[PDB]
Amino acid sequence: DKTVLDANLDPLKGKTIGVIGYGNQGRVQATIMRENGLNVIVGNVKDKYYELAKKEGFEVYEIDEAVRRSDVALLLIPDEVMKEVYEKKIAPVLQGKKEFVLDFASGYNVAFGLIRPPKSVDTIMVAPRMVGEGIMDLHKQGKGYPVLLGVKQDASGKAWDYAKAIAKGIGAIPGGIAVISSFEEEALLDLMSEHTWVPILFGAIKACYDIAVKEYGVSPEAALLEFYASGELAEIARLIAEEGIFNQMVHHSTTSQYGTLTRMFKYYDVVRRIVENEAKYIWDGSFAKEWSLEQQAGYPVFYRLWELATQSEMAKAEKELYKLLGRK
Amino acid sequence: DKTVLDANLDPLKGKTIGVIGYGNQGRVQATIMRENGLNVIVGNVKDKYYELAKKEGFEVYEIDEAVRRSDVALLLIPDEVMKEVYEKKIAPVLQGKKEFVLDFASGYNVAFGLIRPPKSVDTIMVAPRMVGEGIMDLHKQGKGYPVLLGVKQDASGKAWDYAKAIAKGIGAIPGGIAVISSFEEEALLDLMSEHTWVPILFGAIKACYDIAVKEYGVSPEAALLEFYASGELAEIARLIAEEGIFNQMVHHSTTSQYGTLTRMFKYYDVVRRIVENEAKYIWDGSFAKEWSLEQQAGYPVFYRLWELATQSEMAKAEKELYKLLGRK
Amino acid sequence: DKTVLDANLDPLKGKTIGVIGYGNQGRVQATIMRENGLNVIVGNVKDKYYELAKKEGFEVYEIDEAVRRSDVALLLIPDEVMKEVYEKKIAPVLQGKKEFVLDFASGYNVAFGLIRPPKSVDTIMVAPRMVGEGIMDLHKQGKGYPVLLGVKQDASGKAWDYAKAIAKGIGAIPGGIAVISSFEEEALLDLMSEHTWVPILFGAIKACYDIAVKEYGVSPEAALLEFYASGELAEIARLIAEEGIFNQMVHHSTTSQYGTLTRMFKYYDVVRRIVENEAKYIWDGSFAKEWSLEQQAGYPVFYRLWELATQSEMAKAEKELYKLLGRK
Amino acid sequence: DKTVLDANLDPLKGKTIGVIGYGNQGRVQATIMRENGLNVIVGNVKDKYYELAKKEGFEVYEIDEAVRRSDVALLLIPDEVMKEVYEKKIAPVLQGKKEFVLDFASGYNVAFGLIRPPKSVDTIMVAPRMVGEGIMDLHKQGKGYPVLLGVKQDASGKAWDYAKAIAKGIGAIPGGIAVISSFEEEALLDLMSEHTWVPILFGAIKACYDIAVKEYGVSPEAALLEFYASGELAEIARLIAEEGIFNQMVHHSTTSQYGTLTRMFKYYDVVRRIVENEAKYIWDGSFAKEWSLEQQAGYPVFYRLWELATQSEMAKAEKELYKLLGRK
Ligand SMILES: [Mg+2]
Ligand SMILES: [Mg+2]
Ligand SMILES: [Mg+2]
Ligand SMILES: [Mg+2]
Structure with missing residues (x-):
């Protein structure tokens, strides 16, 4: 079957990663992948969350500064404000890039055309199916958890490998599974x-x-x-x-x-x-x-x-x- | 019947004209009426088209600038951006006028109320029925071509005369026809x-x-x-x-x-x-x-x-x- | 998989062909296969067309006479009169044949049962998809053009070969295509x-x-x-x-x-x-x-x-x- | 206006007339116009009606023969057999005519396309509104009676005049009327x-x-x-x-x-x-x-x-x- 159970993790070793938002999801993914041996930086506005993340050991910045430094990014924020942010701060720096990887947690703002990035970028998708809390309560058992994968735009043929490496870096696999869609x-x-x-x-x-x-x-x-x-x-x-x-x-x-x-x-x-x-x-x-x-x-x-x-x-x-x- | 076949051209000799946009239509209209004995100036943003028009022997200014110098204007641009343009650059310079003539190629943005100019202005309409390219392929034979005329607001009683003069100045008549609507x-x-x-x-x-x-x-x-x-x-x-x-x-x-x-x-x-x-x-x-x-x-x-x-x-x-x- | 692009042409060398009608289609279909190295004879009523076909170098006979000489035939005439013709002149001369091939340009008069020939005959179909004029305008470029093939009655297992040879003999292929239906x-x-x-x-x-x-x-x-x-x-x-x-x-x-x-x-x-x-x-x-x-x-x-x-x-x-x- | 009450009769003096059929209608019109100063001949098959018509003082021929002699004709027979008659006996004798006039009493076989004569012919219509018998019971009082006129094909600009002359020749006018239709x-x-x-x-x-x-x-x-x-x-x-x-x-x-x-x-x-x-x-x-x-x-x-x-x-x-x- 299409299903996948495990894959490699090398394409994310030698690069830096930029995590956006530190709410429920952003906090978890961030920590779990800091544990798996990855360099991580956060992007967020100076508020409650801002202090919470650095405090856990992270070097916290604002948003667009975390992108110039990164070759990859995770846009873990609600689907109601994600649009504006992408047009003001991200879009320019993105235009001023060479080879980028952009990840999401939902396809609403994309599938419906509310966001149309360039062709110089590899666009991907990773969607868990857990409320957000029990995910940690399970990872501490080494357990995995299920996710959904997908792609909208690939310019290097490596998008699927990147997505599998990501799903691995967050403890979802091995132990859980990941579907292609x-x-x-x-x-x-x-x-x-x-x-x-x-x-x-x-x-x-x-x-x-x-x-x-x-x-x-x-x-x-x-x-x-x-x-x-x-x-x-x-x-x-x-x-x-x-x-x-x-x-x-x-x-x-x-x-x-x-x-x-x-x-x-x-x-x-x-x-x-x-x-x-x-x-x-x-x-x-x-x-x-x-x-x-x-x-x-x-x-x-x-x-x-x-x-x-x-x-x-x-x-x-x-x-x-x-x-x-x-x-x- | 209503139909018209030819009329005068004198009311437009002694004045200046400002053509907005140098796309498919504007280019053709200007290139043609530069030959029928008229002085012409263009208004457009500095982009590809900007270099093309002046290259053909025109003097190119900015939009608002091309209006202060003119007593007439042709707003030949799409119906999807015309609104903002009219509201930002034109409206003030037009308030600061005395007797103006404003022309269009479609009635969408007007007939539906998306544009409500003042009463100190003569508003008219001129609408061809050609794809835009064949118009040249036909004028080269001296042919005319068909158009639609109309008016929304006249403050000098000369509107219809201006419209007929325009339709003549672009080679549509004689040889073709023009309808009133x-x-x-x-x-x-x-x-x-x-x-x-x-x-x-x-x-x-x-x-x-x-x-x-x-x-x-x-x-x-x-x-x-x-x-x-x-x-x-x-x-x-x-x-x-x-x-x-x-x-x-x-x-x-x-x-x-x-x-x-x-x-x-x-x-x-x-x-x-x-x-x-x-x-x-x-x-x-x-x-x-x-x-x-x-x-x-x-x-x-x-x-x-x-x-x-x-x-x-x-x-x-x-x-x-x-x-x-x-x-x- | 299904489509065809080229085939052999030998089965039509050593045989004669009888073309019925010299209207639009019969005119084109004839000259091309005359060029491709085939003996061709026409059958038609003595009228305007009768003078035109021979004038182009053909030997013109009467319809019934053109079949006694031929082992193959092309019935290129309208679907509104073909019935009477087939019933009066053709059928009698056709009973005394042994191995015959009969071709059409449409399936109306056949598919609906208005014509039911014998079983000692190979029935086939060839249907272009062109107005009839531009086909000759294109053949001069060596071009091909589309056709549809089909069969209703084969008593020699060679029908498809005959049909492909025909389509190749009229310049439709190679260069164009041919479908089986x-x-x-x-x-x-x-x-x-x-x-x-x-x-x-x-x-x-x-x-x-x-x-x-x-x-x-x-x-x-x-x-x-x-x-x-x-x-x-x-x-x-x-x-x-x-x-x-x-x-x-x-x-x-x-x-x-x-x-x-x-x-x-x-x-x-x-x-x-x-x-x-x-x-x-x-x-x-x-x-x-x-x-x-x-x-x-x-x-x-x-x-x-x-x-x-x-x-x-x-x-x-x-x-x-x-x-x-x-x-x- | 729009109606007629009387008109001239000279265009039918100097010519001959061929009355087809001697049934109820033909008998009446013939017997009548034999009085208004017209030469009349009949065409019909040799049966009862034939004997009756020649007995009443007419000279009778066969249908096809009655047309070679005439420049005009009245086709007064049912609408159920007129077609075959026109197709067999009339059409051949009619192709070799120069300027002819053909009259009817009903437009069924024509209006619906069941008859399509040539263009060298003048086609007309004259339709009374009486049972056929009482028409004579009224004419002997000098009365007129109603009719309907019409035309399908005029090649001499004289049809209407011919139609009025006919309506007069049968005593329908003056005294009655005639309508245009x-x-x-x-x-x-x-x-x-x-x-x-x-x-x-x-x-x-x-x-x-x-x-x-x-x-x-x-x-x-x-x-x-x-x-x-x-x-x-x-x-x-x-x-x-x-x-x-x-x-x-x-x-x-x-x-x-x-x-x-x-x-x-x-x-x-x-x-x-x-x-x-x-x-x-x-x-x-x-x-x-x-x-x-x-x-x-x-x-x-x-x-x-x-x-x-x-x-x-x-x-x-x-x-x-x-x-x-x-x-x-
Ligand atoms: Mg949800
Ligand atoms: Mg349009
Ligand atoms: Mg057809
Ligand atoms: Mg009746």
């Missing part, structure tokens, strides 16, 4: 999840609550206990990842199995058409445009929805309960 | 063509290819030969422009005539509905809004579509083929 | 083009005109200048055939590209449905029946439509105009 | 009547009968008395033709007027849609195709319908009844 094939995923089943689930829960209350005379303090106020859900999401998704149900009763399976094979089509519509809306690039426009307006909708959701009925009752049970 | 009546046209039959044609071709392949087991190397890989279309367009649209078919076989006529009179309503929808969407001004917003966003959709189209199935086969026939 | 896979093509995008295009243009006029108060003398009275379509088709279909647009503006691409990916479904319907209506053979019937009636619909189309407002306006521009 | 504007009419209200009326009557019987227990021997077995209808049509269509109702009772007017303004749209569909089906020429094909088959549908209609229930009841009232 494109940028689109990662943004598509990181969005669909945030668009199809999370909101569907939330709305289904809210609807169960509303119906149980306003049509069957049920107490608000009860529904919550069953639906999500109890950690039964976590128990499900756990056995899912460990024992499997379907084999998980073997631990529950037969009635639950029957109802679940029937109603699952019964509603599979609606969710399918929904997912189709959303994925199509994304593939073309409308959602990026929508989000950028909303940014250009002042996040009005965001405000009103963040209001409505909290000022709903379920949220209030949840408040009294969580208080009554000590839950903060 | 508005700005809307030109943008509407220059858009509808780009919105109704070009894309319908392209999609129909693509669909014929896809169907022929994926449902009848046909070779990709064949369909192209019939549909567009052969220059049969060029002959059709030529006979259209020269002999007539319908009379053209007299040269083809009876079977083709029958099929074409029937299937045309059969599928006329659908395209009519489509065209109605699009023209209505334009008349109000939504398309301009959409385009300006996409500009403000970063042309994501443009990028993704330019990607999909090329990464299609037909394009790859056409690429394999063009290489095979020797076609570059 | 069936009769259907050519009739389907030569029809769909005449059924799907040509009439859709014509109707869309007509509708654009009608709408622009009768709902926005536009002048008839103007719309034409934009839509087709200018040869912009010719430039589009030329760039299509030469550089590519989509890459063609790079020479246009950005607004045009955006509108075109959007409206193309927006309507792809409707035309797909249309094309499906038409291709299905053909595959089964209904259109052939329709056309064979209309002939038995007197071409009434043909007449009425040829009338309506010409007596439309657009045609009258184009007539008033083409006069005004000197166009005959 | 085309061939289409005559066949369209002569068909619509036979397609829209005649069959609608018949079906409505049949339906009233069926409903009255099979849902309200009525006697078959009664309904007929009311619906059409009584001549009440004839009076309505007579008053229509004489006093007017709506003023007619003044003689009936109020209740009738109210119901009629209401249900008339209530059902106007449906019949309008029907008529639109039918007129459109005609204008293009599909009905002619249909009829010619049915002719080419054996008139099966005609037979089956002539059977069904007569073998209905209403017909059997009317047969039992008419016998009971002495009606043959």
Whole structure:
């Protein structure tokens, strides 16, 4: 199969590396690769993070100074401000380079054309699939972890080797794995999840609550206990990842199995058409445009929805309960 | 009827003219009217074009400078950057004028309100209907060529006279003609063509290819030969422009005539509905809004579509083929 | 893999050939193989053409006489009269043959069963993709040109060799190419083009005109200048055939590209449905029946439509105009 | 204006006329114009009509012979056999003529392209609006009567004069009138009547009968008395033709007027849609195709319908009844 389990690490010995940002991700990658025998420098503005990184032993600079010194760079910062930074400070120095390597953690700002670097550069991609904290909690066992690879522009044929060397330098492999894919094939995923089943689930829960209350005379303090106020859900999401998704149900009763399976094979089509519509809306690039426009307006909708959701009925009752049970 | 065939040229003798931009159009217009007995000056930024115009015997200044010296101006540049230019350099120098004449080549940035000059100015329109190159290939025979005229604001009653004088000064008349119309009546046209039959044609071709392949087991190397890989279309367009649209078919076989006529009179309503929808969407001004917003966003959709189209199935086969026939 | 570029030519040395018809095709196809070192004889009715072919150095006989002498034949005449000819003069003289070869230029009269020759005959197909005139303009460069091959009935296992030898004998190869296919896979093509995008295009243009006029108060003398009275379509088709279909647009503006691409990916479904319907209506053979019937009636619909189309407002306006521009 | 009431008659004095057919129409026009000072000859096959026509004082020849002698001709025969006749006997004798005039009584076989004479000929139309018998019953009062005129092909600028002279030579004017129109504007009419209200009326009557019987227990021997077995209808049509269509109702009772007017303004749209569909089906020429094909088959549908209609229930009841009232 395409999968990869280990590779070399030499192309990054003899060069310097410039890490951008020192948030959750930037901190981890940086340290782990300082351990693997690499020269590392950071680029960031003088703020809280700035003091935190040097303090761990690093020689911290500002951003564009960390690039003139480097032949490689890691742009580990959010996808909402990464654009502006690339045009003001980076773009000129980048133009004034000969052979560079530029890395990302997400393909949003690239796959959709919001960033179009030159052809004198080797562009790559490296995307983990961990929340960011447990990654360290696992590396201390020598464990690896999974990632996604990809490339958009190679001018030396060495892009894949560079990417594998990177994935190795961060403890992801050996021990874990790394897949080959494109940028689109990662943004598509990181969005669909945030668009199809999370909101569907939330709305289904809210609807169960509303119906149980306003049509069957049920107490608000009860529904919550069953639906999500109890950690039964976590128990499900756990056995899912460990024992499997379907084999998980073997631990529950037969009635639950029957109802679940029937109603699952019964509603599979609606969710399918929904997912189709959303994925199509994304593939073309409308959602990026929508989000950028909303940014250009002042996040009005965001405000009103963040209001409505909290000022709903379920949220209030949840408040009294969580208080009554000590839950903060 | 409305049509005009020739008029005077005296109102432009005794004045100066400022031609903005020395691209395809501006170059031609200036080169021509330098011959009809007129003094001409250019305004443009110092780049490739700047060296070319002066090289041809012109005196080249900066844009704002070329206006202080002029009582007339030709704003021959794309409709995508004209706004900022007009707002920064022109607007003040124009406020500091007494009686001016401003000319365009399209009505997009005006008809839709993206430009609202003062009332101390005569605003006009002159729109050819040629690709830009053949205009020279024809003037060398002394021929004329067709144009569209219009006016948005006149404060001296001489606007139409100025417009006719201009159309004469560029060799369009006599020999060709000139029509009277508005700005809307030109943008509407220059858009509808780009919105109704070009894309319908392209999609129909693509669909014929896809169907022929994926449902009848046909070779990709064949369909192209019939549909567009052969220059049969060029002959059709030529006979259209020269002999007539319908009379053209007299040269083809009876079977083709029958099929074409029937299937045309059969599928006329659908395209009519489509065209109605699009023209209505334009008349109000939504398309301009959409385009300006996409500009403000970063042309994501443009990028993704330019990607999909090329990464299609037909394009790859056409690429394999063009290489095979020797076609570059 | 599939395509062919050159082959042998020996099977046609030691044999005679009988060319039927001396119209456009028969004229070119004959001279070239006469040059390539082949004995050639023509069969045609004694009329204008009859004098032309012999005048060029040929020995002209009558059709039935040209077959008794030949072991091979080329039936290069329209698909509307071929049936009677084959049924009256050819079939009788053909029963008393032993090893014959029969060639065509189209598969209409065969693929649809309107002709069912015997089994002692080798039936083949050769279909160029050129207007018929430029083919000779190109052969003088030693060039080749495209063709489609196919077979319906082989009683000697040598049919493909004969077809390749033929294609080589008319200058199409080497220099050009030749594809292997069936009769259907050519009739389907030569029809769909005449059924799907040509009439859709014509109707869309007509509708654009009608709408622009009768709902926005536009002048008839103007719309034409934009839509087709200018040869912009010719430039589009030329760039299509030469550089590519989509890459063609790079020479246009950005607004045009955006509108075109959007409206193309927006309507792809409707035309797909249309094309499906038409291709299905053909595959089964209904259109052939329709056309064979209309002939038995007197071409009434043909007449009425040829009338309506010409007596439309657009045609009258184009007539008033083409006069005004000197166009005959 | 737009109408004619009288005109000259000299262009037809000094010439001969060939009247084809001696049926109801031809007999009348011939007998008449033999009185207005014209030399007349007939062409027809030797049968009853031939003997009758030569008995009435004419000199009779054979059709083809009657044309060599004439410079004008009247083709007064049905529209179902005219084609073969024109193609066999007339066309050959007509190619060798110099300046001819050809007249019709209906535009069916022409307007639809089933006949396409040469260009050295003057083609015209003259269509009365009478059953054929009463025309003589009226002429003997010196009256005129209505006609329709038209032209398809004039090569001498004299057709209209010829047409008026003809309309005069038959006593239709003065006393009557003559209208200007085309061939289409005559066949369209002569068909619509036979397609829209005649069959609608018949079906409505049949339906009233069926409903009255099979849902309200009525006697078959009664309904007929009311619906059409009584001549009440004839009076309505007579008053229509004489006093007017709506003023007619003044003689009936109020209740009738109210119901009629209401249900008339209530059902106007449906019949309008029907008529639109039918007129459109005609204008293009599909009905002619249909009829010619049915002719080419054996008139099966005609037979089956002539059977069904007569073998209905209403017909059997009317047969039992008419016998009971002495009606043959
Ligand atoms: Mg995310
Ligand atoms: Mg344009
Ligand atoms: Mg063809
Ligand atoms: Mg009739």
